[PDB]
Amino acid sequence: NFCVQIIGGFFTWTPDGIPTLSNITIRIPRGQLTMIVGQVGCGKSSLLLATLGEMQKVSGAVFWNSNLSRGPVAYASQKPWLLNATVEENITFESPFNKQRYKMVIEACSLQPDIDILPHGDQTQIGERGINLSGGQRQRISVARALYQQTNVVFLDDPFSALDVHLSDHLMQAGILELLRDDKRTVVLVTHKLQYLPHADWIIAMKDGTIQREGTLKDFQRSECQLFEH
Numbered sequence: 001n002f003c004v005q006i007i008g009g010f011f012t013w014t015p016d017g018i019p020t021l022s023n024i025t026i027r028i029p030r031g032q033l034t035m036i037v038g039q040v041g042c043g044k045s046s047l048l049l050a051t052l053g054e055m056q057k058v059s060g061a062v063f064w065n066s067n068l069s070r071g072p073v074a075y076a077s078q079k080p081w082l083l084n085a086t087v088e089e090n091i092t093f094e095s096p097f098n099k100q101r102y103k104m105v106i107e108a109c110s111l112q113p114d115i116d117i118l119p120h121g122d123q124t125q126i127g128e129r130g131i132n133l134s135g136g137q138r139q140r141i142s143v144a145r146a147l148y149q150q151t152n153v154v155f156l157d158d159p160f161s162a163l164d165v166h167l168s169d170h171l172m173q174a175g176i177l178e179l180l181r182d183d184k185r186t187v188v189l190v191t192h193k194l195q196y197l198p199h200a201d202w203i204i205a206m207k208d209g210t211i212q213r214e215g216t217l218k219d220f221q222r223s224e225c226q227l228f229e230h
Contacts, residue, residue, distance in 0.1 A: 001065040003153055003186045004028035004051060004214075008059025011050035019058050020046055021209035028188075028202065030067055030152075033180055034214055035189040037197060038206035044190050045078055047206055048157060051188075067152045067186070075155040076146050080138035080162075082127035087115070090126055093145050101148070108175025109144040110168045136163025143172075147179065153186045160193035169195065194230060 009024020021043050028034050038044050049055050052075045064070040083090045091105065106112060114137055115122045124131045126141065139162035146154055160169045173196055180187045197203075204214035213219050220226055 002027040002029045003067055006062040008057060009062060010059035011055035011057045013055060015056060023210055026211055026214045028214060030186060031184045033187045033201035034204050036204050036206055042207040043209035044206050048077060048155060048190055073153050074146050074149060074151045076142060076157055078157050080142040082138055084125060084127040084129050087122035087124055087126045090141060091145055091148055095149055105144055105148045108172050109140050110171050111140060139163055156189045158191050159189060161191050
């Protein structure tokens with residue numbers, strides 16, 4: 001059925017009661033790039049965790065089915081999770097190594113300057129107990145790790161918010177759209193970047209722990225407020 005379909009959506013973090021969000025009703029079928037947008041702190045992370053299944057639902061199970069009966073779904077959430085090992089092994093993350101695929105990802109991630117600058121290249125101990133890098137560079141490695149996995153569903157949180165460099169984001173944005181189009185996979189991104197906020201693909205708005213709709217960009221015109229005129 002729908003890759004991201006929610007019936008009740010009464011997820012909560014407290015084991016007993018106190019629902020932090022409820023009345024969630026979305027249905028995202030396969031091959032539907034549905035980025036998630038909203039205001040600051042409007043339960044975007046909680047909704048993303050509830051979608052993965054890390055939050056205790058109250059109303060009931062949102063139901064799931066095999067993309068092409070489920071539960072293994074790619075997800076990254078907030079903050080960079082870095083493996084304290086070599087950068088190259090961090091990128092692969094228990095995945096087969098293809099030179100063309102690795103070069104394609106590093107081109108989209110624009111990690112060539114990062115590897116060249118480091119004296120040991122991508123063999124440096126990235127993360128704790130090693131070489132300390134920039135926060136934006138940590139996010140670029142983190143987001144590229146999920147993308148390189150080549151899965152049918154990809155969940156991302158603040159890909160461009162951590163680093164708003166036009167050169168890095170645009171190539172990553174171009175790489176993300178092209179890779180998703182070729183693979184016909186599902187992509188969900190939570191970010192505050194207005195560079196690609198409107199798109200022909202589906203968009204879902206999250207506010208006050210609920211989602212108004214997850215549909216075409218024409219709903220923004222249908223909505224009373226057109227994102228405050230961008």
